[PDB]
Amino acid sequence: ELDRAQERLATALQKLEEAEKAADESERGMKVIESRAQKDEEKMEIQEIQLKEAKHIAEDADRKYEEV
Amino acid sequence: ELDRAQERLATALQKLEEAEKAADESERGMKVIESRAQKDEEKMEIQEIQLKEAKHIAEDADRKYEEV
Amino acid sequence: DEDETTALVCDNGSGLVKAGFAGDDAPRAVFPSIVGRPRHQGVMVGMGQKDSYVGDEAQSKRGILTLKYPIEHGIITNWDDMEKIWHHTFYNELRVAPEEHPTLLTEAPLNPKANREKMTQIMFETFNVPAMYVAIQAVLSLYASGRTTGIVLDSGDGVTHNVPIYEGYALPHAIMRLDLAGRDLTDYLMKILTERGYSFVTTAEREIVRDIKEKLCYVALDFENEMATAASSSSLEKSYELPDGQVITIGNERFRCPETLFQPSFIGMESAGIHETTYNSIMKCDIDIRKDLYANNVMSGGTTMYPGIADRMQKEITALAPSTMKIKIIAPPERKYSVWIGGSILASLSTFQQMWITKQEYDEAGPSIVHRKCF
Amino acid sequence: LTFVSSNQSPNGERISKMLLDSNPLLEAFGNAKTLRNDNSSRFGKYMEMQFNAVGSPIGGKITNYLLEKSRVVGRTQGERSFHIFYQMLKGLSQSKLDELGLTPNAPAYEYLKKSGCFDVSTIDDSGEFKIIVKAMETLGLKESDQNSIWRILAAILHIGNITFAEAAEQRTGTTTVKVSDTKSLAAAASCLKTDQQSLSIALCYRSISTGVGKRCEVISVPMDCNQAAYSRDALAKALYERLFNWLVSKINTIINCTTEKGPVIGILDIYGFEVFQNNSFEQLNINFCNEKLQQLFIELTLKSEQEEYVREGIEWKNIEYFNNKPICELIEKKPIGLISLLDEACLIAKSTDQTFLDSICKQFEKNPHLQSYVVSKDRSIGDTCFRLKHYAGDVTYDVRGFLDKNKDTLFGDLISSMQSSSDPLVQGLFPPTRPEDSKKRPETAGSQFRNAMNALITTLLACS
Numbered sequence: 001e002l003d004r005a006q007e008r009l010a011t012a013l014q015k016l017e018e019a020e021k022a023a024d025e026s027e028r029g030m031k032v033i034e035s036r037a038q039k040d041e042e043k044m045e046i047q048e049i050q051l052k053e054a055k056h057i058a059e060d061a062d063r064k065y066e067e068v
Numbered sequence: 069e070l071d072r073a074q075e076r077l078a079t080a081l082q083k084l085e086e087a088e089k090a091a092d093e094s095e096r097g098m099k100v101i102e103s104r105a106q107k108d109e110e111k112m113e114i115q116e117i118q119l120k121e122a123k124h125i126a127e128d129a130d131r132k133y134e135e136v
Numbered sequence: 137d138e139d140e141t142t143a144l145v146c147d148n149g150s151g152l153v154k155a156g157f158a159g160d161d162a163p164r165a166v167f168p169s170i171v172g173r174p175r176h177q178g179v180m181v182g183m184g185q186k187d188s189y190v191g192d193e194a195q196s197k198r199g200i201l202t203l204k205y206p207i208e209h210g211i212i213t214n215w216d217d218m219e220k221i222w223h224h225t226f227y228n229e230l231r232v233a234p235e236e237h238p239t240l241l242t243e244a245p246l247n248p249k250a251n252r253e254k255m256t257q258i259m260f261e262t263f264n265v266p267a268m269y270v271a272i273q274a275v276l277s278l279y280a281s282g283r284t285t286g287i288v289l290d291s292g293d294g295v296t297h298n299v300p301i302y303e304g305y306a307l308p309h310a311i312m313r314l315d316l317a318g319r320d321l322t323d324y325l326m327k328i329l330t331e332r333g334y335s336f337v338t339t340a341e342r343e344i345v346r347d348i349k350e351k352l353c354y355v356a357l358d359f360e361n362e363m364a365t366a367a368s369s370s371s372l373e374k375s376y377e378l379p380d381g382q383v384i385t386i387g388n389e390r391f392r393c394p395e396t397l398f399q400p401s402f403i404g405m406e407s408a409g410i411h412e413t414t415y416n417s418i419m420k421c422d423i424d425i426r427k428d429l430y431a432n433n434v435m436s437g438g439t440t441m442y443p444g445i446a447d448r449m450q451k452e453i454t455a456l457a458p459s460t461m462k463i464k465i466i467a468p469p470e471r472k473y474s475v476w477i478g479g480s481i482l483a484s485l486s487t488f489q490q491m492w493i494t495k496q497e498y499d500e501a502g503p504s505i506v507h508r509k510c511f
Numbered sequence: 512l513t514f515v516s517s518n519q520s521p522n523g524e525r526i527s528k529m530l531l532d533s534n535p536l537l538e539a540f541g542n543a544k545t546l547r548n549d550n551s552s553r554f555g556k557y558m559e560m561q562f563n564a565v566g567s568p569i570g571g572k573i574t575n576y577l578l579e580k581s582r583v584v585g586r587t588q589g590e591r592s593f594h595i596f597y598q599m600l601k602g603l604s605q606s607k608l609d610e611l612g613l614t615p616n617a618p619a620y621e622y623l624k625k626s627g628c629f630d631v632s633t634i635d636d637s638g639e640f641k642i643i644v645k646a647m648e649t650l651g652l653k654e655s656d657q658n659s660i661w662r663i664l665a666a667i668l669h670i671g672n673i674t675f676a677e678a679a680e681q682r683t684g685t686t687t688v689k690v691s692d693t694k695s696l697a698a699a700a701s702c703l704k705t706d707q708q709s710l711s712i713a714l715c716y717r718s719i720s721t722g723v724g725k726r727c728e729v730i731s732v733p734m735d736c737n738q739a740a741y742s743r744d745a746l747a748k749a750l751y752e753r754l755f756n757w758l759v760s761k762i763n764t765i766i767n768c769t770t771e772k773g774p775v776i777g778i779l780d781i782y783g784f785e786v787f788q789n790n791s792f793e794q795l796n797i798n799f800c801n802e803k804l805q806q807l808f809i810e811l812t813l814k815s816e817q818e819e820y821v822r823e824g825i826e827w828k829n830i831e832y833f834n835n836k837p838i839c840e841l842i843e844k845k846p847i848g849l850i851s852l853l854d855e856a857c858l859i860a861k862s863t864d865q866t867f868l869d870s871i872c873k874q875f876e877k878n879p880h881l882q883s884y885v886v887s888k889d890r891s892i893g894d895t896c897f898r899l900k901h902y903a904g905d906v907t908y909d910v911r912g913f914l915d916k917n918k919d920t921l922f923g924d925l926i927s928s929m930q931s932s933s934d935p936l937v938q939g940l941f942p943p944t945r946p947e948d949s950k951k952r953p954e955t956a957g958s959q960f961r962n963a964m965n966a967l968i969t970t971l972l973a974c975s
């Protein structure tokens with residue numbers, strides 16, 4: 001029975017190493033993307049303010065043009 | 069020695085399931101964030117196009133103001 | 137390869153050495169700079185100890201090594217060890233003789249005049265080097281893109297350099313030298329970990345800190361908002377089961393140390409954040425030079441790979457500075473080898489003859505020949 | 512050579528026919544059109560003639576160099592790119608085209624759009640196609656071998672579609688390269704059967720770690736469009752260069768003999784000195800060969816031969832010997848020389864074309880035999896151009912594209928990809944490592960090409 005258990009243990013550790021490796025690459029991929037997601041989120045917010053500012057200044061210029 | 073082999077088989081088989089489980093969850097978390105990242109990336113690029121236009125319109129109004 | 141002397145390419149720092157074969161694009165052998173003793177007694181007969189252990193040999197087995205740091209910003213506690221460190225590079229791996237090919241090295245700005253001559257003495261007198269040169273770190277990372285107007289900030293383990301080298305070099309002061317890079321970061325973490333009980337004492341595990349750092353640790357976007365986030369245990373508690381056998385949940389420890397970068401007040405100095413030093417190098421130059429500097433800011437050095445290092449710059453620079461031009465920082469993706477890319481160039485340039493030093497040139501103008509003529 | 516060398520053997524004069532028909536054979540595949548000649552060969556060739564025990568020849572090897580590889584992306588109006596791309600279309604059955612994922616419309620692609628021209632007034636490939644096919648099967652290139660070769664172009668045509676819409680993704684740093692239409696980049700890897708994602712992540716992006724092992728490739732380096740397009744082409748060319756030279760060797764598989772080994776009579780044949788009313792970089796390389804060709808004669812009919820006169824001890828005296836022009840050689844070899852100052856600038860990417868120009872006028876225009884506008888006050892020369900005096904007349908050059916076209920630098924990132932692929936050809940195009948060129952592999956091609964020309968001169972000096 002020991003010989004049979006040893007055989008099952010050998011292949012078990014091999015599958016374990018493969019599983020952990022797949023998880024290690026998956027958790028890393030999820031991370032780098034999460035960082036990029038937050039990096040893009042900040043860029044989206046800072047530009048969201050610029051877009052509004054760019055619109056308001058345009059409307060203000062039009063109102064300024066109407067006066068003159 | 070058999071008891072030790074069986075003991076290692078138990079912790080290995082269990083950790084194998086956990087490793088595989090984590091790999092799926094990590095990939096699951098990667099997918100939901102990846103999708104959102106792509107949506108943001110697209111939305112951001114569209115705003116940049118509007119940002120440019122908003123500025124050009126603002127500048128055009130200023131140049132049109134100087135004339136008058 | 138065969139015809140023409142063919143020169144090598146190298147870039148030595150105060151932490152990691154970069155060197156490969158000849159006519160290459162990137163370093164082929166990057167061994168760590170470590171050399172200690174067997175405070176213990178080697179087995180003493182299970183080899184006549186000596187070899188403080190170095191290269192992948194020492195790094196593989198730190199355990200019984202009292203890692204002695206020879207090169208500390210400027211001062212080299214002992215030169216005798218450096219001789220046998222270079223006797224390993226050119227031969228054990230490259231399998232080529234320096235008594236045949238030229239040599240290229242890097243220059244640490246504002247380094248004692250006596251050092252540049254002591255090194256050359258080792259080459260010309262013993263390693264017989266009829267042709268070599270020592271170029272300036274940052275300037276190399278430059279000549280490798282497509283413009284003659286960019287400001288560069290090159291650093292790694294040695295010291296920080298804010299060099300606005302674009303159209304020319306050296307005028308009033310602009311450039312800055314700050315002893316706060318790499319080794320400084322590795323030294324600061326162990327001190328702060330003591331608050332939680334963890335105390336990596338000896339200099340061997342001190343290196344483990346650096347190893348662990350470059351895998352998960354990141355920079356705080358805003359320490360204020362991230363502090364309140366500590367209430368949650370998802371983005372904070374990070375998993376890293378020690379290869380030995382004891383997990384270290386680096387949660388608030390990851391984005392704590394990097395804060396020192398922006399706040400040198402935590403290391404006993406008056407130096408301001410790296411975004412103030414940026415102004416310090418811009419306000420000095422002419423007035424009609426700024427609008428294009430903001431449009432191009434080169435950030436070289438593998439140190440600038442920490443998550444949350446570039447996005448912070450746009451927040452602080454746009455604050456207390458002119459805001460009607462294109463604020464733009466060029467942070468090369470793999471910016472660690474930016475110096476190596478430029479190094480392979482100088483070694484292949486022909487105009488290089490106008491700059492390099494020839495065997496006889498070292499004897500005619502004496503040892504000072506180098507930095508007495510060039511800059 | 513024959514008759515003189517010879518006769519009897521029925522398997523001699525008969526196979527001599529297929530060998531004499533080997534000339535027009537290779538003039539239909541590798542050749543293209545030039546305004547100076549229609550049958551313009553587009554591959555270096557230094558043939559070698561061996562002999563048999565009976566008298567007839569046994570076979571010979573072939574060697575090329577450089578290969579013109581800027582015509583695929585850029586050329587003058589009216590001119591036309593390689594023949595294989597156009598003759599193949601107006602011929603193959605529509606059914607054969609669709610299988611390769613092709614549509615009867617050049618503008619649709621990129622490989623044929625980079626020029627802007629498609630139809631030629633003088634050429635009718637629809638009819639000329641039957642002349643090439645008659646050469647395909649007659650020699651010994653069955654459709655099986657043809658399709659095999661097409662699987663390489665089939666991929667290239669799937670890779671060629673990869674165009675870009677200037678991606679200003681990076682908030683600040685450097686504009687990256689985005690590919691929304693991924694099916695082009697997907698089909699690109701479908702033929703190679705490699706991971707579509709990893710491929711783009713391991714090529715467009717450079718990576719290195721290192722530590723006695725051999726690194727883990729993944730780290731990213733997005734770069735500008737020019738460098739991206741540079742890398743794109745750099746591979747597209749060398750991939751086909753090695754094949755053609757290995758193809759002609761396999762054409763000799765049913766021709767070359769391996770029974771005797773003996774003396775070798777060589778025959779030289781290289782691109783000719785072309786002349787337009789408007790030159791550029793690609794002309795320099797061709798015109799440069801003539802500068803070496805003139806040096807060859809002066810080395811032979813004026814030096815090595817004169818030394819033979821006195822060796823015999825026969826009346827001879829040095830009659831007005833015009834300049835041996837070794838200056839034209841030293842001006843572009845040893846330190847402080849043209850290509851030594853040129854290739855050096857090719858690496859200094861921050862030295863574009865205008866700055867590079869200034870590194871020539873100052874370095875020269877003082878050394879004899881080289882003029883420009885500044886020194887020689889002639890309006891015909893532009894402020895950005897210069898006057899290069901050959902051993903013949905005068906030629907002026909432009910600057911458009913100088914760098915990316917000249918650099919040639921091909922690192923081991925675009926090359927290694929195909930080597931690690933799984934296909935009997937993709938790795939086959941890269942034949943048994945080290946064919947007459949080994950030494951050390953990892954190094955810019957700027958020096959590799961320099962060795963190619965040096966392998967041409969050194970082997971011509973010590974001979975008859």
Ligand SMILES: Nc1ncnc2c1ncn2[C@@H]1O[C@H](COP(=O)(O)OP(=O)(O)O)[C@@H](O)[C@H]1O
Pocket residue numbers: 149150151152153291292293294318319346349350437438439441442472
């Ligand atoms: N992938 C990485 N991410 C972040 N930091 C890294 C990475 N790889 C290396 N480093 C760090 O870069 C520094 C070494 O960079 P290097 O350019 O060799 O420095 P120096 O030349 O000053 O010795 C070390 O602090 C190291 O931890």
Ligand SMILES: [Ca+2]
Pocket residue numbers: 149273290291292293294295
């Ligand atoms: Ca440094």
